[model samples]
Target: HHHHHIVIFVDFDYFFAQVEEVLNPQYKGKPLVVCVYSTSGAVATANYEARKLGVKAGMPIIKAMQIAPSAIYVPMRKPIYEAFSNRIMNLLNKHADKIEVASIDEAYLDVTNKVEGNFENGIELARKIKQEILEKEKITVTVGVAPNKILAKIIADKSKPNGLGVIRPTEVQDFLNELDIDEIPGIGSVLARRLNELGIQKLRD
Candidate 1:
């Protein structure tokens, strides 16, 4: 049975970093990293500009400083971020037929039964959600539309930082063929190593 279930993954780009930018407009477009200042905590998140300079979440703050010493550092403010998260989730529930909050800054929407399961309509819905989030919260989101949850997530990852991506059922295999094994939803470090030992390096394999 070939059932095309339209799923969308909406991910808030560099979530903590993005939230900080929304709160402080002066930080926009700069290399920013969000972390708790202590002698011990790792980076919580890094904005795209800082990412380009090798700053990553979970990296030691000292290492991040070594790589991009000029980057702006902001401490994580969880309460305000949670408030924004709730707002975004509420907005999604209002727009989507069904929603699964994947994380603080990510969600999955099941819209197969709505919009007549049309990819074009799915794209329209994604754009609407994106627009609404931006207008209401002043933070950008990236959306991915596909026939299943995993592919939807992959599509969203591909469309980082204020963008949208759509993948039709007909193109699923082709899409997977171009992806690395790590890009698939379930393949983490351990699984990836196992697959490597078995000579399975790409998702298509």
Candidate 2:
């Protein structure tokens, strides 16, 4: 059986960090931590440098610092992130006929029928989107175009920090099966454990 659909996944690179960096240029290229509910709890995100030192998204600020003392930490600014989100949403609305917002930092567009049958057209579409986002909002996004939602998501994820990915219908299984199961969505730590127990560690295998 063969079917084709135009699915595009839009993603922001270091969303909060990028927004903070753009608004406050001093933080550019520096390790920045975007915390959520610091008064209530702990840090939510640590920049790449912190990640290099074993700091992670949910790590406590104190623990994060124990690893990367130089990392910059800031409480989550939902209002700011939301404003950025709205700007991206507006951009998507202009470019896509149908859109699904996955989160503050991601969106999916059904562009299959909108563009010409050629998939390169989709790539061009993504390029235009990336350009607009950078020019108008001063941020970066990685866009993925594929025959379906899953493949599109895969490509989008593979290209981070301003990039694009595309997988046609013919390449879906190969693209997915060649990777580790941990790459798939919703197969987090608990599911990974269960899959390991069942001797089903590899993806699409």
Candidate 3:
């Protein structure tokens, strides 16, 4: 029965930089890296274009500049991003049976009851939510659907930046087999054991 339960997770792709792009359409498709210009000067978010140019989140600004001298670098706008985060969280609440905000940019959604134990519906629901967020927010977000929050968040992270991923009712075991252990971190083996047990039950063995 646990295997039949479904959860979802959403991640705002490069949330800070993307919000800047939304406000300044010209920044779209550019190498935009939002950073915290502290004494240490670390990156906060690097949009895809910046990523392609070898800029990365948490890299020092000097290193980022060395890699991407022409890239547009901006400091974090915390208050504006907080406002955007609040709006996105409110938007997601409408879709979740229950929701937990994990960060300003990510959340886990429990939706087993909403989908009536149907993994197909869960997958479709994730897609619909992804599209709806892009339509309403004018920015892309990643979505993941799985039997538990742990795996769902993993799927969301691996999918990244406008992708949607779901582990089907039949493929939980296979999916875990292929997933890198480090990708799931502390919950890897324990969660896999639990999921394997659920798979055994569903297999009626």
Candidate 4:
């Protein structure tokens, strides 16, 4: 009966900001903004603490400063951040045979065969990954385990900032039923608005 597949998506929380904060203990628990203050002066990322003040990735550094004047703005340290990212991916490789790095801050792992198609096993694997990252990197990651990639990404987003979630085959329909259509991967603002115009506001629609 355990013939189905399993996919897990892992996303680092405020990746760049987290790395900066962890390296500089004084920045911890503060609104940390990571970005480039060059020509564009754009924000690469911001920790959750800064997000509460409306700072977001791709936002202008000036705007972020205005929103959170006391926030600590840090320059992007690619070398350090990449070192941590590589370490995390390397750790994941130990448990997975097929892993796709979705982005520098996120990855997709196909663990169906490795976990024997068991959801509990999938959850355990996710927990192990999270624990490993925390122990070695001092940064937290959220994991989502599901039967497919799309659902895995969604669940991972739903359980953010150091958490884990699973969407079993039996709960897929209900899980997507009330979720906003815009929340689905690849569904941007324009498409989401178009869907809304047609009264399709939820994924189930």
**Candidate 3 — what's its lDDT?**
0.84
Candidate 2 residues 87-204, lDDT tens each?
8888897767588898898898877677855577877888888888999998888888887776778777888757878787677777766877867766789988888888887876
lDDT of each candidate versus the true structure = 0.86, 0.78, 0.84, 0.86
TM-score for each candidate, following the candidate numbering: 0.92, 0.90, 0.86, 0.93
- Alpha-carbon lDDT of model 4: 0.86
Deviation in Å, model 3, residue 177 alpha carbon: 2.2
What candidate 3 gets wrong by more than 4 Å, as runs, is 185-205
Determine the backbone clash count of candidate 4.
0
Error of 4 at 176 (Å): 2.9
The sequence of per-residue lDDT tens digits that candidate 1 reaches over residues 47-151 is 989999999889999999999998998899988888999999988887666889988998999887777777778889888888888899988889999888888
> Which residue pairs in candidate 2 have backbone atoms (N, alpha carbon, C) closer than 3 angstroms, thus clashing?
none
- The list of candidate 1 runs beyond 4 A from truth reads 1-4, 37-39
Worst 10 residues of 1 by lDDT: 1-10
**Tens-digit lDDT track for model 3 on 90-153?**
9889878899999899888888888877788888988888888788888789888888887888
Candidate 3 residue-pair clash tally: 0
lDDT of 4 by residue, 84-175 (tens): 99989888877885989877888988888888777788889889888888988898999988888888998888788788988888888777
